[PDB]
Structure formats: C-alpha cells, structure tokens
Amino acid sequence: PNIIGPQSGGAVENLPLHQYEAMGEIQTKIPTEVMLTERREFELSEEGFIGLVFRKDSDNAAFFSANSTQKPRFFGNTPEGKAAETNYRLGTQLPYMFI
Amino acid sequence: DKALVDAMIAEIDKRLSSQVNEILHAKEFQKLESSWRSLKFMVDRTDFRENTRVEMLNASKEDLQKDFEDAPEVTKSGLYKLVYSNEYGVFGGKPYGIISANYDFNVGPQDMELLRKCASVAAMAHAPFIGNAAPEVFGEESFLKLPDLKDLKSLFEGPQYARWHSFRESEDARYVGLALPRFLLRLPYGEKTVPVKAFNFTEDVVGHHERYLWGHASVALTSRVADSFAKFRWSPNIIGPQSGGAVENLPLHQYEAMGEIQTKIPTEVMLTERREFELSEEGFIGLVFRKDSDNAAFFSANSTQKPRFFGNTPEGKAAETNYRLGTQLPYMFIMTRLAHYIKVLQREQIGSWKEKSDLERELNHWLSQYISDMDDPAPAVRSRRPLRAARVVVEDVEGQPGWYRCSLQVRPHF
Amino acid sequence: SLKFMVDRTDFRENTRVEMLNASKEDLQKDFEDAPEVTKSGLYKLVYSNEYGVFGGKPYGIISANYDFNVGPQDMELLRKCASVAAMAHAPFIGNAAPE
Amino acid sequence: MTRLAHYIKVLQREQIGSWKEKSDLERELNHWLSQYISDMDDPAPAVRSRRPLRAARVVVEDVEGQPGWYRCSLQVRPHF
Amino acid sequence: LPLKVLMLGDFTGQEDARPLEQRAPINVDKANFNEVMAQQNLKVTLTAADKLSADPNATMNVSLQFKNLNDFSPESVVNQVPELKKLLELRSALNALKGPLGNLPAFRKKLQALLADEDGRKALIKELGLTEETK
Amino acid sequence: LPLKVLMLGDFTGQEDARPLEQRAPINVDKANFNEVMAQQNLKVTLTAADKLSADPNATMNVSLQFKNLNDFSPESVVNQVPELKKLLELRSALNALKGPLGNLPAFRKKLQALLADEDGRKALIKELGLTEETK
C-alpha cells in the first residue's frame, strides 16, 4: 500500500543525470521527458494516469498517486449516496486494491 | 486589477443567486423536495432492527377521492385492498400499524369526505390515519396568525364548519388524527451555516416565511409512535416532554432583527399553554415549541372525535370516563395492537377442540401477558405492560355450534 | 466583576461556569410569553438541558447580575426565579438596589 | 439538600431496571447516605465540613396500584 | 408482529395513469432509501421568473431530474439548468483568470466554448461578456 | 458531580433579538476568558458631554469596541476617540519639541499631520494650536 509518496515509499531515487551545454550555460537532461507541475500531474490523475513526477533538479522522482483506469461514479449527495461514493473511490484506488 | 475581476464575480454570483432563489422557492420544487426530505427525516429516525417497517404509496388527495367515489363501497377501494385485504385480512400476512398521509386539510367538502373515507378504513383495519391541517382551516393566511385568534371554540361555531362538526360526532372519528403547525426541515443556504460547492450561494429568505422549507409534522408524530414501539412493542408513550412525545434536534436560523439577531422558530409560532389547550379541546394535535430550544413537544394526542357528556351520576360519570378513553389515541393504540394479536393468534386456533370455558381459560391466560397489576409501578415500566386490569366473557352463538361471542374489556394505566 | 469571580475559582477542582446574556426586561418577556415556567427558555437551559437530562449534569447555582427594587416587575421576576430554582434545586443569588 | 438531590437523581437513574424490592431500596440507600455522615464524639472542627451530616433516616414504602416503584422519605440532621 | 406504517402521498410531480389498486407500495429502509428514489425517478417540469435579465415577460422553463436527495442541492440545480451552468462555468473562468491560473489565449478559447451554447439567450451572453476584464 | 454556576446578565450594550433559549451559554475559564470577550464582541455607542470646549450644547458621541479587559483602560479609550487621540498625538509632539528631540521643520510637518483630521472641530484645532510655543 506504501507506494504513493515522496516519504511514504512512492519515491524513485538515484536517477541518471546528464549535464550538457545550453545557450552558453550548462543544464541537465531531465530524467523524465518533462518536469511535470502539480496541476498537470493532478489533471493526469483525474484522467486515470500514473504520472511519475520529477523532483525539480533532483535525481529523484515520485508517484503522488496510483489511481486505476476506472473512473469514479457520482451519486446523490445524501448520507447514503456519499457513503456509496466513498466505497467506490476506494475501489478505484490501487493502494487499497492491493490489500 | 484583480479587485475589479472579483467585483465581476460578486455581481455574477448576485444574479445567479437571484435566479437560484426562484428555483428553490418554487412551490412545485418545494412540494417534491419537502416530500422526500421529510420522508427521510422520518425513516432515519426509526430502527428497522426493532421490527419496524414502512411502505410508500404514491397517491394524491384528488385521486383518493376519485377511487373512493368510483368504488361502490369502501370494501372495494384500492386503498382498502392494499391496507386491509393484503394485510390484516390475509392468513400469513401482517396488519398495517398506522397510516401517515402527507396532506393538508381544509374545511372544504372534498377534504371532509376524504376524512370520512379514511376514518371508515382506519376503523375497519384498526389503524389510525394521521395527517395535518392547513392554516386557512382557522381562517388565517398562515399559522403565524395563530396568536391573533381570540377564541377558536367560538370560531368553530360558524356554518362554514358544519360538516367538520358532524365528523367530530361520528364514531369513526376515533381513527382520525390531525396535526397543527408545520416545522422547518432545512436551514437556508449560507456560506458558513450551510455552504455549497463552487458557487458562493447565500439563500435570501424574503418577508414571506413560505420561502422556508416547511415540513408536515405528521412525520414527527410518526417518529414518536416508532420510538415507543422500538422500546416497548407498544405505542402509548408519545405525549410528553419526558414521556416520549418530545421532538429533539430541530433546525435553527439566527438572523438580524431590529438591530439584534433572532432565531426563526422551528414551528411557525411559539404556542402558549392556553392556545395549545384550546387546540386540544378542538381535537388538534399541536406540536408546541420549547421557548428557545431546538425542542418541541406533543402534550397530548386527542383524536378528532368529540367527547360526549352524560348525566352527573355514578354511572353517567363512568360512561364519560370510558368514552374519553376511547377519544384518546394513546389508548386507542393499545386497543389496535390487541385487535391485531387477536386476529392473528385466533386464526391459528381455528379447528381445535374448544368449548366455551376453554376459550375463557385460554384467553384469560393470554391477556395476563400484558397486565401489570402490582403494588408500586416501575414508572414507565407499565409501558411494556400497558394494561392494569382486564375481563373476558365468552358465550355461545345459539344455533351455531363452534361459534362464540367474546367480550374483552380492559383498564389500562392512566 | 465576572473576571474577579472567575480568577478566584479553581477549574481543576471540578468547578464550571457558563455565561448567559439576558436582561431583566427580556427575562420578564420570556416568562410572561411562555404559558408555563416549564416552557421558558431559561428553564430549558437550566433544568431541561442539565438536571433532567440523562448523561448531563445539574446546575449548582445561578448568579444574576441585577439590582432589585420593590417594583412589581422585579417582584414578579423574583417569583419566577424562585419557581425555577425550586424545580432544579439550585438557589438564585442577586443584589438589592439602594432605593 | 441541593447536592443530595443532584446525587439522588443521577445515581438512581443508573439503578432503574435492576431487581429492587422495597427493603433492597432501604438497605442500599442507607449504605449510600452513610458516606456523608460524621457521627462520632468530637468532630474535627471544620472537618465535618466534608461530611456535613450528623444523622439521617430513610424510609421506603410501595405506592400501591401497579408494581415496581416506591415512595422514599429521607430526613437529615446536619451539623450546626 | 412488526410495526408497519403506510406513508401515502404525492411523491412525484404528476399523477399516475395506473389505478390505485394496481400501483404497488415500496418497502423503504435506511439501507436503500436512495435506491428507492433512483428507481422511483423524480422529474419536475416547471417555469419560474427569469431574473437573469430585466424583462417581466421573460420566463425560464426547467426540467429537473432527481435520483437522490443531493439532487436537490443548488449545485445539482445549476448543473441541470444550462442558463445557470454556463454562468457557473463563466465564474470558474473569471476566477481562474483573476488568480492568474491561465493565460489570456486559454481564457479566450474557453470563453468562446462557454458562450457557444445555442440554448443561451443573446442578452445573457452579453451580460456574461460584460464581466470580462478589458485586459 | 462538578459545581457548575450560571452567570446571567447584560454583558452587551444591547439586547439580542434571539429567543432567550435560542441563544446559547458560553463556558468560561481562566485559560480563555479574554478569548470569550473577543468572540462576544463588545461595543458601546454613547454620548457624553463635550468638555473640550466651553459650550453646554456641545456633545460628543463615541463608538467604543472591546475585545479584552484592557480595552477598558484610558489608553484604549483615547485610542478609540479621535477627539482625544489627536490631543494625545499633540501631547507627544509638544513633549518631543520641548525635550529637543526634533527640529522645528519636523515639528511643523507633524503638527499639520495631526490637525489635518477631518473629524476634528475647528475650535479643538484652535485650542491645540494655542499650545504651540511661539518660537
């Protein structure tokens, strides 16, 4: 269950680095193709994708969440309906699916 | 620059809330909403693990009149079919405890006739019919005018109430029970007390308290019956702030007054003891508001039936006592439970070798099960044993061997 | 005066104090508006929510920051306070005005 | 008197439902009231403060006419 | 013997053609109340005064649908009324722009998207565009 | 059983429209008394005789606000009444000048600042300027 946090156990450490010349300076090829921002990672999570985000200038990346492909269902906003929503989302999350 | 954009958001939300108020204050929308929400407010206050059951029957008053007038007799009405026939009069089935009608009644002839039919059905099935009365029944625009009424008893002398006056004298009126003021179901939307997502909606209740989501108090009374039955298997403890007629946890709404800030009463008005007593004399079930609480109480549950007066002699006063006992729902419920048990249990005895004295002995031994004839009584423990005394006599139907005539008279606790 | 009272007590010794903002005129307004003392707000928050509540606790005493004259309104207020105090078994303490 | 009334309400509520006969009420109530009684020879002055009562009498009858509840009389003689 | 109660009332926005003796009752409990609502299927076709403009002859007809009690919340009401849902989307666009969450090109594209709805009135569209900061 | 006392009284400058039992009681203790004052919110709108001039028809209306007991001190009272706060600023200016803590140009600038307050009376302004040494 512990695979969705920089401290919880979803952190990937020891990524390769590659410094090379830029426009007269020298920058490192990002270990992932892009440096994903928090908003973009959140959008990908809403789209059911597991985005490995790069720690700004790290050799470290992190999986902030491991949602499955399944899209959560919406229920009427009553006590029972919100309970149903909670259970369903729990089902939609791999960190509990593993248990 | 951003301050101007925020002003734009303020005006936009202002217009949007202007329209949303029209939606949320629409009479049709509030009809549907209050129906379902009051229904849930009843259901979630019961305990289905205590053998409590509830069924929903979608029917409007107009269609109730349509069925009752279309049928040649009440025994052939659909409601009677699904209340008595499919339940109390069905071997292997179960009888309906009570009927809660989410309706408001006026003095109109259609409403009076509907009440007559409901009284007949309730009498045939031994189950009371509970509903509510509309404000115009008192000749007032809304319950908020109740403190201006100087004398309800004199108000009811007008010819406009002739039919109601006769209805109160019918012997089926014991199965009719109407409640007075309604009660709040939802606190108005507000960014602090009742916020919503995204849109910064602040519900604006105008001068018309009809903007508030009022709910039919019949459901609250039903919760009372439910609690009594969940604790004891009997429904007599529903007429006191401590006995079990108290409704707790009412919504509140503080808002500015004339420079102070005051709370919208959960009921339309704060009924005084004298006014509540007058309503009780008029056969109404008034849910009184505990002066500044979120608590209300039903001080009494008299039926619509008016008590009869007898000559002031020992026998005459005895007759008065019995009749009033009949006029009170808190004892009518004991009678109804007894009738259900008698039907069910006797059906199983049909066919056995029973002589008259055998009926006498068995019935006595059975009735003793609900009798608490002791010395000094576990107060609210004679709740589970509501009867204090009971007498049973059994005679023979002459010229019909195997059939008997049974008389059961009970003295319950006061 | 409120603080002079509070800071001379010892909350570690199971001592508690609640504040109820009410003027004498409004006390008379509530007591006369209600049909009976058992339905007054003060009775609600003194007896009903305390001594007569399973799981609750009863109010020890009531301290009213008021001065009383021989006026009929003050006399009636004293009558109501005596009734409530008798019903809840808690004395009502106040002060008398020089007049 | 007021403290006694509070304790009686609270503690009796918890006893509702138990198998109590009249004499059972008498014995239990006596044993309980003794907790605040200081009836010796010469009192620790301002120590009968914690035990304000010197004497106490309790009588329990049954209210007749339906059975399980009683009429209790409690009279106390406190220190002067 | 259980304690069974019969709640009779107008739980729908219209009367049923089925006769009373034919329509059936529904057993309700805490573990299926919302399911009972969804299966009953709630619908309200109603007209209220159109306060999104300044015309007393302007009226707004709505067709709301209910499956659970939370469908009675203003969020659902707005979700089911495009004349208000478009205004909520405009609200989100303006808050995003004012908080600097998106650039002006994205803001313009999304604004066109919101105003493209053919069910909206031109007056409403003009009132919405009047809220856009000049920059 | 704890010993609970109920202090009932007029702790505010006005009555509430709130039904007596609608309003709730507040638990008070040594670790939160001041917080209880601040949350209760104290305000006094009152008129007293204006003794800053020589006119019996002159009256002064003040709107004091209280969050803690020290808001009852004369320093807070002056802070909340501009007709006196300006006089305290003038006092500080005169003491600074007489103690040689500031030069005459700074003194003049600050004096203009103090007297610029539009809520002050011209008579008060004249009385304040009459206290300035000629040099």
Coordinates of N, CA and C in Angstrom, one line a residue, chain A residues 4-11:
Chain A
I4 N 2.9 5.6 -2.8 CA 2.3 6.8 -3.4 C 2.7 8.1 -2.6
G5 N 4.0 8.2 -2.4 CA 4.5 9.4 -1.7 C 6.0 9.6 -1.7
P6 N 6.5 10.8 -1.7 CA 7.9 11.0 -1.6 C 8.6 10.5 -0.3
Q7 N 7.8 10.4 0.8 CA 8.2 9.8 2.0 C 7.5 8.5 2.3
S8 N 6.3 8.3 1.8 CA 5.6 7.1 2.1 C 6.3 5.8 1.4
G9 N 6.9 6.0 0.3 CA 7.5 4.9 -0.4 C 7.3 4.8 -1.9
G10 N 6.7 5.9 -2.4 CA 6.5 6.1 -3.8 C 7.6 6.9 -4.5
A11 N 8.7 7.1 -3.8 CA 9.8 7.9 -4.4 C 10.8 7.0 -5.1

